[PDB]
Structures are given as C-alpha cells and as structure tokens.
Structure 1
C-alpha cells in the first residue's frame, strides 16, 4: 500500500450531482511512462502557476502521485501494471489526470487505458478538437474546425470479447454459430478469429444524453450522431435510432420538415440544437470538406477513436489534443498520445495535450479562471511562435524551446 497522501489537502467531494471542491483538493496524477516523464512536470508547473495567478494564492492543489503502467512494476511488483488501489483512489478522490501508459506485449495485458475506462466505468470520452491560431496544419482552412467528440467508452468491439483462431473457445463459438444459429456468412471458419461487438440501449442512451446536454449547456448548434449503420443495423444502426429516440422523448425534439433530423430547443437561449446523423465513412470526408457543419459529435467507441485522431491531425494538434474519460463517480483526464521512448528523458516533446487536459480538468472542478489562464498561455506561446520541435520543424522563423521551456513560455503568456 504505497501512495503518499498530501497531508494538507482535502478530497474532492460529491454532493449529489455536484462536486464540492475544497480550496485545497488532492488530485491524483499518474506520471505516465516513456515521455510521461517530461510532459507531466511541464503540466504540474504550468497548472500550479495557473491557480496561483487566478485565485491569488487562495487555492492550492495537493498533488498526489499514483501509478499504473511501467511505474507500477518498478514500485510494487514486476507484474503489476494496474494496482487495485489505483482504482479505489480515482474513485475516492473523484478527479485524476494522467500521462501516457505503456502496455507490455507478450503478457496477456489488454490496452491499459481501455482497462481503466472499463473498470472505472468512465462511459463518456470527451475529446474537444479546435484550431489554435498559428498551429501548423496540413489543411488549408483549419480554423473552421471546432468540434466535440463524445466517443462512448464501455462498449462496441472495442471491449475485447475476442477468441484466438484455432483455440477451443474460437472453435465452438463458430460451431455454435454454424449449427445452432444457422450462420452461413462466415466464408472461412477454419482458422478464423471471432470478435463480438455489443451495443445496448442503455450504453447508447447515456452517451447521447451527455452529448445533447453539453450542446444545450454551451449553446452549441448541433449534435451529429455518427454510425456505420447502413451495414451495422442492430448495433451502429441501433445507436442512431436510440440516439434519436432519446432526443425525441427526453429533450422533446421536433421532426424537422421530413427528418430524421430533429429541432430540440435550447431552454436557456431558446435556440434550436439540430440532431442530424451522418454515416461513418462519409463523416470522415465531410470533416475535411464541410468542417463548419459539425459541432458536437456522438459515436460508438471505435468510430470515436478514428474520428478523433483524424480531426486532431487536420488542426495540427497531433500532440496538442486534450481529452477526458468522464464517468459518473469520477473523471480521469489524459494525455491523448503514446509514450515515445526514443525521445523520452530528452525533454523535447510537446506537453500541450496533457497541459490542455489539465485545463479541461480545472474547468470541470469549477476553477474557470485558472483554466482560462492556461487557455491563454497556450494561445499566446503558440501565436508567439515560441515553440517545440514538432511545430517548429514546420513553422517558419519559430524559436525552438524544450518541453520545459515551452511550459515556461505558456506561464509567461498567462
């Protein structure tokens, strides 16, 4: 039992659908493997600057380190990549932030980030994606992208119910299917790997309610449901209709002229949030070709994964992209990139993802003013062309700063 609690500090508390943030919250952070080691400090510093600038010394976060990944095997045991105690702690502390986690191949360990999302049941995975002025982009008009992806987390093929080809479990899921279910469309059973894709009504509805409710809450223009429903009828296809049914019975959506698009009024502003839908392979196109038609996006696990990383590259934000996993009893904000071992310890990586995820946490905790300062340090440093090797290698006349030095430059721009 090896975490050392900050002695000064209090736990974030939940008062029935509200958080109760102390002035001094203890916030767990997993340092992160690989380059986790450079960005997590650049984040600790520029957020500790952020609450000291905004609440003028009245608020203070009590950082408490936890482990997962590779840092649990060098602390607990050579075989522990996710302690049970880590699960307890995100749950009790309510909020945690984390850098990148490596998952060993060769040992039975599923992707550790998905392991955390499922075991804690962080059903919403909220990944903003917008253009910061001056960010090097592949695209001609990156400023039309300002979208919000609510990839569902607990479900879809992405859960990992899969059995190895020519094992027994693989062998008799197929024997069951060929005989008992009468399945004819498996071309080759012999030496065939089988995966299972779930998509329930509850897991769909709960994700889409948080998608509509965020578009109400921030006076956004639309919630697009993305799905490859025209082939995946009773999973993706179902997510679309459930999505719609909840829009209609819970938020009272009106049919728009012939449909299936609905008009939900935004009760506060009286505006109309549109509820369209777009089939998953065309959506990947409409985001480079009509990016300004999209605003909030709701989708199942796999498509949110791809849609996110596609949209993140369009805005040159491969490593500036923030992201969270919000659940109902806790929320864990994360670096959306991997560990980089060739660059790790070299202090050259971009800490922008994790610092922008730290921004998403602070706004969630209610500390608006702190979060806002970090959003300006960020906009300032990047449009001041005083940047880090990934932007700089593509940015004319940029000054090259090390990861730390870029943390520094966000602070001075606050």
Structure 2
C-alpha cells in the first residue's frame, strides 16, 4: 500500500520444497537505517553488474523497496517500525535482502532484526565465516578459519519471556516457583528479574537436520554441536542429545568407537562427516587455538550469536561478514553489522557485508555464476589493496576508496 511493485518482474515460487526462480524475479530489499543508505546502493549496483556479466542480458533482478525500522516511520507514520505488509511481502516474494536496522529504545519495542526472524519463522541463522586473503587480521593464521554457523533462531532466551524485578508478574511467577514448584535455589527472590529459556525437540532437530544436510550437500568434514549442557541439562544438554539422536536415526550415524562421536557417510562423496560436541567455553578457545579442527557448527540462539561475532573478528571481517535467516517458506539475507549513524551518508563504510550476503542470496536462488563472480570481485579488490577506510587503517600500501567506489572495484575484478 506504499510499496510500488515492479511492472516488469515475476514472483519466485515455491514448488514443493524447491524454488522456481524466473529470469526477471522481483526481489524485495529493505534499505536499512544509518549506513544502509550507503551500503545498499553499492550492493544493487554490484549484483546488477554480476547478473549482467554472468547471464549476458538474459536475466535481470526487479528490485522492490519495502520498509522496516526508521525509514518505515517516515513512510507509514511515526508508530510503525514494522509494517504488517513487510511480513506478507517477504513471505510472498520468497527471498529478500536487508541492510542494518535501528530498533528504538523507550518504546517497549523488542529487537526489529529478531522480530523479522520470529515473525516469519526463519529458524536458521546461517553465518559463514572464511578468510579473504589479504584482509588484516588480529590473529597469526586466519587462513585456517573456514566455518559455517547454523544458529537456531526461534527459541532459547531470545523468545523474550521475561518479567521485571518488583513487577506483579515477576512477583507471581517467583511465588509459583518457590511455593508450587518448590524451588529453593534463587539466592535473592526479592528485587529479582526473571527470564525463561525454552529448548524443544522439534526446534533443535529442524536446525540440526539443516546443519547435517548442508554438510552432505557441500561435503564438509564435520558438524560440531556446541552447548553448555553440563550446567544446563534440560535445554542445552537436551540439544546435544537430540542432535546426536537425529544423526543416528535419520543419517545413519554410527559411533567412532567408544563414543560419543558419530560417523555419517556422505551418500554422494563416500566421505565421512564426524558429528561431535564441544562445551561452549572451551569452544571459544578451540576456535582460536585449533581452527582447522572445525567446520560446520550447529548451536542454539545465544551461543551462535557470540560464536559468529567472535569467528568474524578473528578473520578480520567484522564489516564483511554475511548472513541469512532461512525458514521453510522464505529467506532474508542481511548485513550483519549495525547502523553506524555517525558515518551515514558519508559514502565511506564497507559495503562488503551486505554484498557477500547478496552472493548468498544469488546462490540460494540457484544463480551460482552471478554469485561466483561477486566473490571473485571481492578477492580481487581486497588483493588489489583497493579498499575502504576500515581496511586501509590496518594496511600498508592500500589505496583508500569510498563505499561506492569499492562497489566499482568489485565490478572491475569480476
């Protein structure tokens, strides 16, 4: 009702699990608050250059702007941070990409990013992190990191079931716990905030299955379930058990003997995928100390949030880190950094994150060539040391380009 759906262009279609993508598909994009205003123009430009190059004119993307966050209040009015038609439109057109999003404080409004993920039941947050040769890194051997994070997006403490200290609600559920559940374990039951952490069997088996399938499909070497289950037995310890169980029941997992690790034969390559677990505090060490030991990572919502950020810092890509939130009916590719308001409009930040998320998008649509061209362009530009301010600070010999210009540098190395 304020979106102008393109005259030329045809919806992607979901024909029983598989995506039927037209040659002129309408992809919705949410511009993004803050630096979205800079990074997004850079991505439409390089995706367009990459599908024109790959398919020689045959295919073209019809971009359709939809609204969430701060720009939505300037379009639908002050109170609408998340319009109900953005949810219908993403659902409808099947794949979408977005830039960074401002959630307001003071309004009782929960994270708009998390909101899109729960509202549209996009239960897979998939964050790939690998090293691009030549980016500055804090660590000695970032080239050893090449991991894929499958982070659960629909349950854990992120469900947002919590009550204020001294509220009536909080007073009521603490009474139920102490009186009716007989809990003698809250150190200070007075002035006490309360949060609920749910972890169900369906929620974790659907994420673990996506994780192992991804491993089979790209014949990755292993799947590590990380958790803190020695302390949280019935939510995080349930997650490692339900994941070993699904590997044994649905993928023919077998002990590498003695336990606990499982072998899964990839039906396609003949290779074995090891299915293992590491406790989450030790994991944060093991990714710094032995990165080559790890590959596909399956984990619950809070832990995957931390593991992503941490893995991203080490390979030197906190501003060129892509991501996706995938469910059964649709997907939303996103820049994974924030809105950086101090730089907005200055054309200077790194468009690399939202760009590499459009190669994930292009890849997901089956436009694999367009997509391989974007990562070709990326390695080209970085290796050219034809880089944006964030990378240049840390490099000797680089040429500083603006945001729009690193767009063009990616197109030149295609």
Shorter-chain TM-score: which interval?
over 0.9
Query: What is the alpha-carbon distance in structure 2 between the residues aligned to residue 157 and residue 189 of structure 1?
Result: 20
Query: 1:263 — aligned with what?
Result: 263
Structure 1 runs of 4+ aligned residues shifted over 4 Å read none
SS in 2 for 1:71: helix
Query: What is the alpha-carbon distance in structure 1 between the residues aligned to residue 171 and residue 293 of structure 2?
Result: 46
Query: What is the alpha-carbon distance in structure 2 between the residues aligned to residue 198 and residue 364 of structure 1?
Result: 30
The Cα shift of 1:168 comes to 0.6
Query: What is the alpha-carbon distance in structure 2 between the residues aligned to residue 189 and residue 351 of structure 1?
Result: 48
Query: 1:384 — aligned with what?
Result: 384
The Cα shift of 1:189 comes to 1.0
SS in 1 for 2:64: strand
The Cα shift of 1:259 comes to 1.0
The Cα shift of 1:70 comes to 0.3
The Cα shift of 1:181 comes to 0.4
Query: What is the alpha-carbon distance in structure 2 between the residues aligned to residue 108 and residue 328 of structure 1?
Result: 30
Q: Which runs of 5+ in 1 are unaligned?
A: none
Query: What is the alpha-carbon distance in structure 1 between the residues aligned to residue 159 and residue 67 of structure 2?
Result: 23
Q: Which runs of 5+ in 2 are unaligned?
A: none
Q: TM-score scaled by structure 2?
A: 1.00
Structure 2 residue 55 is matched with structure 1 residue 60: no
Query: 2:92 — aligned with what?
Result: 92
The Cα shift of 1:158 comes to 1.3
Query: What is the alpha-carbon distance in structure 2 between the residues aligned to residue 38 and residue 174 of structure 1?
Result: 48
Query: What is the alpha-carbon distance in structure 2 between the residues aligned to residue 173 and residue 34 of structure 1?
Result: 40
The Cα shift of 1:5 comes to 0.3
Query: What is the alpha-carbon distance in structure 1 between the residues aligned to residue 270 and residue 305 of structure 2?
Result: 33
The Cα shift of 1:16 comes to 0.5
Query: 2:174 — aligned with what?
Result: 174
SS in 1 for 2:297: strand
SS in 2 for 1:82: coil
The Cα shift of 1:270 comes to 0.8
The Cα shift of 1:199 comes to 0.2
C-alpha distance after superposition, 1:363-401 (max 9, x if no partner) = 000000000000100000001100000110000110000
Query: What is the alpha-carbon distance in structure 1 between the residues aligned to residue 394 and residue 366 of structure 2?
Result: 36
The Cα shift of 1:124 comes to 0.6
SS in 2 for 1:75: helix
The Cα shift of 1:317 comes to 0.2
The Cα shift of 1:24 comes to 0.3
The Cα shift of 1:126 comes to 0.4
Query: What is the alpha-carbon distance in structure 2 between the residues aligned to residue 91 and residue 31 of structure 1?
Result: 18
The Cα shift of 1:22 comes to 0.2
The Cα shift of 1:77 comes to 1.2
Query: What is the alpha-carbon distance in structure 1 between the residues aligned to residue 95 and residue 308 of structure 2?
Result: 23
RMSD over aligned Cα atoms? 0.4
The Cα shift of 1:131 comes to 0.2
SS in 2 for 1:198: strand
SS in 1 for 2:342: coil
Query: What is the alpha-carbon distance in structure 2 between the residues aligned to residue 285 and residue 353 of structure 1?
Result: 25
